[PDB]
Amino acid sequence: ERLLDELTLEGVARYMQSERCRRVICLVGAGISTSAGIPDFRNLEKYHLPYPEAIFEISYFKKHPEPFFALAKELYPGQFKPTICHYFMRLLKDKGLLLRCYTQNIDTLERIAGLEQEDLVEAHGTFYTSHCVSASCRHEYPLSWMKEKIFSEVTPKCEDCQSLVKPDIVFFGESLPARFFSCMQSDFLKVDLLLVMGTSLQVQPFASLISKAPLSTPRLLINKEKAGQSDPFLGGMDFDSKKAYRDVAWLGECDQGCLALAELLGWKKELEDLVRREHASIDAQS
Ligand SMILES: NC(=S)c1ccc(OCC(F)(F)F)nc1
Ligand SMILES: [Cl-]
Ligand SMILES: [Zn+2]
Secondary structure (H helix, E strand, O other): OOOOOOOOHHHHHHHHHOOOOOOEEEEEOHHHOHHHOOOOOOOHHHHOOOOHHHHHEHHHHHHOOHHHHHHHHHOOOOOOOOOHHHHHHHHHHHOOOEEEEEEOOOOOHHHHOOOOHHHEEEOOEEEEEEEEOOOOOOOEEEHHHHHHHHHOOOOOEOOOOOOEEEEEEOOEOOOOOHHHHHHHHHHOOOOOEEEEEOOOOOOOOOHHHHHHOOOOOOEEEEEOOOOOEOOOOOOOEOOOOOOOOOEEEEEOOHHHHHHHHHHHHOOHHHHHHHHHHHHHHHHOOO
């Protein structure tokens, strides 16, 4: 009947290494990056905002961009070092198992860890690239350029047309990337396993993704807290009813959950070597 022989991390690992599991979708949130110690970008009383969310609203940003860039200077991380979880997804990619990583995070660490544009759906956008806001220009700028402008407390302007340059975060008043919908429509016909890591599945439409899986597809949650179950008040996760058949919860730090799964898979040495090498490379940036 069920694809998992037991509703445990061991059952998920056995399934992963079976021929039945070829395509894994990761859905990830802030919990996969808390170990990276990046200031959580998403005090303002001094900017006299007409409403708090104005600092992340596109029309306000075009009127008064300075509050946003002052906050971006304040919360700029000391380093962009991905976690064990990010490199676990890079390993999935290397093993030929990663169909897609859908991320709610804007902190760029998926890209730093080696997931390429085709591997990623950055559902809330990213700080990694920025664009001129003029529709007829849209000149793209990389992270180093913006950092130079931001720490100079110079408002970034396009070299071609002098319009504002905005990081590719999805602001209020903007729609989700069209890539989110096109990839969703195709990927969930193809998925054999959902790995849900470091998200509490509370923000829409990202949460609704778990209900797009085929009914047989196992879903592993690696998270500090159980999440994604149907809300007694309001296709949810069923970990614990006697009808549970495919959903597994591993509760702890996301790094430790990924370590435990890698150990079951025989990947712990590969993962350790990857993380140590990449961290050393980032630490050695001269
Ligand atoms: N705390 C986070 S996530 C953070 C803050 C600032 C920042 O600035 C990047 C750029 F310079 F491109 F704007 N990037 C990330
Ligand atoms: Cl969430
Ligand atoms: Zn421009």
